[PDB]
Amino acid sequence: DSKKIVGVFYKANEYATKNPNFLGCVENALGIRDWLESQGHQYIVTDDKEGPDCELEKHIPDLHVLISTPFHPAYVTAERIKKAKNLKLLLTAGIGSDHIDLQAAAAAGLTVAEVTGSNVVSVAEDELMRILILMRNFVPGYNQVVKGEWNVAGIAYRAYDLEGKTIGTVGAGRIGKLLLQRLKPFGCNLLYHDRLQMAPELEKETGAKFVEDLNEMLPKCDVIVINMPLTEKTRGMFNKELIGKLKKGVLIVNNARGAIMERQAVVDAVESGHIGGYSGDVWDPQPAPKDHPWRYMPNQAMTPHTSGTTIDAQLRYAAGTKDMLERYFKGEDFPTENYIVKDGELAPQYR
Amino acid sequence: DSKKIVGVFYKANEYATKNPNFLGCVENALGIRDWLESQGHQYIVTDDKEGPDCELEKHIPDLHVLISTPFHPAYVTAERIKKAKNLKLLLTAGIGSDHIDLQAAAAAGLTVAEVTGSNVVSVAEDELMRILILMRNFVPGYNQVVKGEWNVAGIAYRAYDLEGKTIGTVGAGRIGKLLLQRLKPFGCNLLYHDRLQMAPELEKETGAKFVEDLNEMLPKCDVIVINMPLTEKTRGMFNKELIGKLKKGVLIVNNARGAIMERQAVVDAVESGHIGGYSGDVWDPQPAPKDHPWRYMPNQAMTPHTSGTTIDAQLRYAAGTKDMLERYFKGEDFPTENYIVKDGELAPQYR
Ligand SMILES: NC(=O)c1ccc[n+]([C@@H]2O[C@H](COP(=O)([O-])OP(=O)(O)OC[C@H]3O[C@@H](n4cnc5c(N)ncnc54)[C@H](O)[C@@H]3O)[C@@H](O)[C@H]2O)c1
Ligand SMILES: NC(=O)c1ccc[n+]([C@@H]2O[C@H](COP(=O)([O-])OP(=O)(O)OC[C@H]3O[C@@H](n4cnc5c(N)ncnc54)[C@H](O)[C@@H]3O)[C@@H](O)[C@H]2O)c1
């Protein structure tokens, strides 16, 4: 009954011990090493995930379970899945399992699951933060401060209050709903697009108006927020043509997945001023290389992939990961909303 | 009965024309020049405000009305008031009139008024954006992006969700109340201190609790927000001893006035880790010199003085300044809430 379990996390070095609940890094490995080893399982943890000769690849031929995390994602390709002779279970410590080839996982009969709900508040907070950072023009003020400069006009000419502006969320699942709730008291005109309409009473509490056809919402928005998974349909959806339909000077927030946008289409439209500003924590690929052009374009307010891995989020997704492992050892089903691929079927929000 | 009117604003140069509503700079000067010249008055506008030899000091001897603005503040000292033989009226385009020597103004019988309520939503927004930026640790992420780095752990060890944290506002007048209303859906433990308690219905809607004694509220707070005027009592109030009563690792937001804090006492407690981070738009003095130490201390999330001068704020304070000039010319009283010094008496919020 003893299994080989591999975890792939970001490496913390001297940061590992600066908070007692820092469960998300390599060194602390979700807090589950002792619990796993006491049951006779082998637990191997690494950040070394790229290429033929990395530590992860050493263990791909015989691991049983692979625990990944979106902030430092192991890319589980069709070729890796074919090499993986004993693999049965792919767990995501966090939310969003698109770093796996989900079609090849379904074709191989693998189970893919994630900790649904675990960091959705955290991302909704970070999104509202970035809307404010772009609208109110925080980044150019910070840059003046560190360079020893002082020029209020260089900031004020394009700074605005959020009050009275039109904000559209593209996707209204768990995160989009939590965002709409936090935006209610700012006094904005809220719109949303999804394949699924929110309940009548949630529309009434938030004041948010359903727009069934995405192309009708886009031109109306001063602010657009991305809030869908990375799926075969959403991949590359914000291309040259779709971005042309946005209001001139639109501010875009994207803490969903970087690859929902076409990389170069965003760069070109930022340089022309057609996108007024772009802010998010997600990139294609991750880690983002040193030369990734989103780092250097005008008006950018980016960070690395951090919003779903606050300390409070880490505690919840480590706990959910442990619960699923415990269920797995006992042959019990996970909560239904956790499955992304089960019995060869993809979950509806990814179809 | 035609008057010399002087305006002191920040200079925009090429930025002036980038927005048709950019009324807060020298070049557009609240949009009132034609209006004032058509009535036979003279309107001298300048940003040059420092020392014996600046353009402002040339007009001090014979001006009738001086319009100042907090973002680029003319320091109207006792020595200046004495030299000002014709001066009758000091108007603040924005909110907070502490850049005037208010005791010398009272002594000389000068009227001091400002545009109450004009940018209070704007600052409430900017405060909440800063709580998020400090709590969720945005600034180190931005810094890594522009330097070409990628290290998630270096940000995540210190990042938390705002949900469930304790936040205290020191002051609950116009801005403090608007902040509390916007914090409500984040699910925090909200406390406030003021000399005046809020209406019970407002306490209930926001969920904020009155703490009558300031010293009792302070050690309880993860986040402290400064929300009072700069007055004889608030000036230097956050000194070595008062900062010591704060929780270790406290995050502080101050978009009120810089001099409410002792400058070096903030530097020391930030260097020690007693203050975990400090964020605001306001400084002593302004413009802040190149070597001001708040620009360079650990964890700082500063900007120049911007939050009360968004485009939407400028439209409101330009209109309120124009309205008080019209009343002035007709011998009519300003709205009661606009007066800071009238008949040699300070307004109650400054006492
Ligand atoms: N930055 C972070 O740290 C972080 C953390 C968590 C999640 N995320 C990303 O955000 C995503 C959303 O999270 P959630 O909890 O809100 O997910 P959710 O499943 O609850 O909501 C997704 C929504 O997308 C809609 N949708 C799917 N395909 C669509 C399409 N083609 N057109 C229109 N609507 C479509 C679905 O109907 C659903 O309401 C995750 O999949 C993940 O990729 C990022
Ligand atoms: N950063 C900006 O752009 C910007 C913009 C507007 C205002 N401000 C600053 O914010 C201040 C507050 O603005 P407002 O509209 O909320 O003012 P307000 O008059 O409505 O509120 C001031 C509050 O301070 C309280 N107070 C005064 N002295 C006190 C003391 N010693 N102890 C406890 N409470 C005390 C009063 O009871 C009052 O409720 C302004 O005076 C200004 O200096 C900054």
Coordinates of N, CA and C and ligand atoms in Angstrom, one line a residue, chain A residues 70-71 94-98 114 116-120 123 126-127 170-177 193-196 214 226-231 233-234 237 254-257 260 281-282 305-309 348-351, ligand 1:
Chain A
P70 N 0.1 26.2 -8.7 CA 0.1 27.1 -9.8 C 1.2 28.2 -9.9
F71 N 1.6 28.6 -8.7 CA 2.6 29.7 -8.6 C 4.0 29.2 -9.1
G94 N -3.9 24.7 -4.7 CA -4.3 26.0 -5.2 C -5.5 25.7 -6.1
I95 N -5.7 26.6 -7.1 CA -6.9 26.6 -8.0 C -6.4 26.9 -9.4
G96 N -6.8 26.0 -10.3 CA -6.5 26.2 -11.8 C -5.5 25.1 -12.2
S97 N -6.0 24.1 -13.0 CA -5.2 22.9 -13.3 C -4.7 22.8 -14.8
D98 N -4.8 24.0 -15.5 CA -4.4 24.1 -16.9 C -2.9 23.9 -17.2
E114 N -8.4 19.7 -7.6 CA -7.8 21.0 -7.0 C -8.6 21.4 -5.8
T116 N -10.9 23.7 -4.6 CA -11.9 24.6 -5.0 C -12.3 25.5 -3.7
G117 N -12.4 26.8 -4.0 CA -12.8 27.7 -2.9 C -11.6 28.2 -2.1
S118 N -10.4 27.7 -2.1 CA -9.4 27.9 -1.1 C -8.8 29.2 -1.0
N119 N -8.6 29.9 -2.2 CA -8.0 31.2 -2.2 C -8.8 32.3 -3.0
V120 N -10.1 32.0 -3.2 CA -11.0 32.8 -4.0 C -11.2 34.2 -3.4
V123 N -7.9 36.3 -4.1 CA -7.8 36.9 -5.5 C -8.8 38.0 -5.7
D126 N -7.2 41.1 -4.3 CA -6.0 41.5 -5.0 C -6.5 42.2 -6.4
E127 N -7.6 41.7 -6.9 CA -8.2 42.3 -8.1 C -8.7 43.7 -7.8
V170 N -15.4 39.6 -16.9 CA -15.6 38.6 -17.9 C -15.4 37.2 -17.1
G171 N -16.6 36.7 -16.7 CA -16.6 35.6 -15.8 C -17.1 36.0 -14.5
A172 N -18.1 35.3 -14.0 CA -18.7 35.5 -12.7 C -18.9 34.2 -12.0
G173 N -17.8 33.5 -11.7 CA -17.8 32.3 -10.8 C -17.6 32.7 -9.4
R174 N -16.8 31.9 -8.7 CA -16.6 32.2 -7.3 C -15.8 33.5 -7.1
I175 N -14.8 33.7 -7.8 CA -14.0 34.9 -7.6 C -14.7 36.2 -8.1
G176 N -15.3 36.1 -9.3 CA -16.1 37.2 -9.9 C -17.2 37.7 -9.0
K177 N -17.9 36.8 -8.4 CA -19.0 37.1 -7.4 C -18.4 37.9 -6.2
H193 N -20.3 39.3 -17.7 CA -20.6 38.3 -18.7 C -20.2 36.9 -18.2
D194 N -21.0 35.9 -18.4 CA -20.6 34.5 -18.1 C -21.6 33.7 -19.0
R195 N -21.2 32.4 -19.2 CA -22.2 31.4 -19.7 C -23.4 31.2 -18.8
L196 N -23.2 31.5 -17.5 CA -24.2 31.3 -16.5 C -24.6 32.5 -15.8
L214 N -20.9 38.8 -25.0 CA -19.7 39.5 -24.5 C -19.3 40.7 -25.4
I226 N -10.5 39.9 -15.9 CA -10.6 38.5 -16.4 C -10.8 37.6 -15.2
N227 N -11.9 36.7 -15.3 CA -12.3 35.8 -14.2 C -12.8 34.5 -14.7
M228 N -12.2 33.9 -15.7 CA -12.5 32.5 -16.2 C -11.3 31.6 -16.1
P229 N -11.5 30.3 -16.1 CA -10.3 29.4 -16.2 C -9.6 29.5 -17.5
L230 N -8.4 29.0 -17.6 CA -7.7 28.8 -18.9 C -8.2 27.5 -19.5
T231 N -9.0 27.6 -20.6 CA -9.7 26.4 -21.2 C -9.3 26.4 -22.7
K233 N -11.4 27.0 -25.0 CA -12.1 28.1 -25.5 C -11.5 29.5 -25.1
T234 N -11.1 29.7 -23.9 CA -10.5 30.9 -23.4 C -9.1 31.2 -23.8
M237 N -8.1 34.0 -26.3 CA -9.3 34.7 -26.7 C -9.1 36.2 -26.8
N254 N -5.9 41.2 -14.8 CA -6.0 39.8 -15.1 C -5.1 38.9 -14.1
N255 N -5.8 38.5 -13.0 CA -5.3 37.5 -12.0 C -5.8 36.1 -12.3
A256 N -6.3 35.9 -13.6 CA -6.9 34.6 -13.9 C -5.8 33.6 -14.4
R257 N -5.4 33.8 -15.7 CA -4.3 33.1 -16.4 C -3.8 34.0 -17.5
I260 N -4.8 33.4 -21.3 CA -6.1 34.0 -21.9 C -5.9 35.2 -22.8
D281 N -1.0 39.2 -11.8 CA 0.0 38.4 -11.2 C 0.3 37.1 -12.0
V282 N -0.4 36.9 -13.1 CA -0.2 35.6 -13.9 C 0.4 35.8 -15.3
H305 N 3.5 35.7 -9.5 CA 2.3 35.0 -9.2 C 2.1 34.8 -7.7
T306 N 1.4 35.7 -7.0 CA 1.4 35.8 -5.5 C 0.0 35.9 -4.9
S307 N -1.1 36.2 -5.7 CA -2.4 36.6 -5.0 C -3.1 35.4 -4.3
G308 N -3.0 34.2 -4.9 CA -3.5 32.9 -4.3 C -2.6 32.2 -3.3
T309 N -1.5 32.8 -2.9 CA -0.5 32.2 -2.0 C -0.1 33.2 -0.9
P348 N -17.4 20.9 -16.1 CA -18.2 21.8 -17.0 C -17.6 23.1 -17.3
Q349 N -17.0 23.8 -16.3 CA -16.4 25.1 -16.5 C -15.2 25.1 -17.3
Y350 N -14.6 23.9 -17.6 CA -13.5 23.8 -18.5 C -14.0 23.4 -20.0
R351 N -15.2 23.0 -20.1 CA -15.7 22.6 -21.4 C -16.1 23.9 -22.2
Ligands
LIG1 N1 -3.9 34.4 -9.4 C1 -4.3 33.4 -8.6 O1 -3.5 33.1 -7.6 C2 -5.5 32.6 -8.9 C3 -6.1 31.8 -7.8 C4 -7.2 31.1 -8.0 C5 -7.8 31.0 -9.3 N2 -7.2 31.7 -10.3 C6 -7.7 31.5 -11.7 O2 -9.1 32.0 -11.7 C7 -10.0 31.0 -12.3 C8 -11.4 31.2 -11.8 O3 -11.5 30.8 -10.4 P1 -12.9 30.6 -9.7 O4 -12.9 30.0 -8.3 O5 -13.7 32.0 -10.0 O6 -13.5 29.6 -10.9 P2 -15.1 29.2 -11.1 O7 -15.0 27.8 -11.8 O8 -15.9 29.2 -9.8 O9 -15.6 30.2 -12.2 C9 -15.2 30.1 -13.6 C10 -16.4 30.7 -14.4 O10 -16.0 30.8 -15.8 C11 -17.1 30.5 -16.6 N3 -16.7 30.2 -18.0 C12 -15.9 29.1 -18.3 N4 -15.6 29.1 -19.6 C13 -16.3 30.2 -20.1 C14 -16.4 30.8 -21.4 N5 -15.8 30.2 -22.5 N6 -17.1 31.9 -21.6 C15 -17.6 32.5 -20.5 N7 -17.6 32.0 -19.3 C16 -16.9 30.9 -19.1 C17 -17.9 29.5 -15.8 O11 -19.2 29.5 -16.2 C18 -17.6 29.9 -14.4 O12 -18.7 30.7 -13.8 C19 -9.3 29.7 -12.0 O13 -9.7 28.7 -13.0 C20 -7.8 30.0 -12.0 O14 -7.3 29.8 -13.4 C21 -6.1 32.5 -10.2

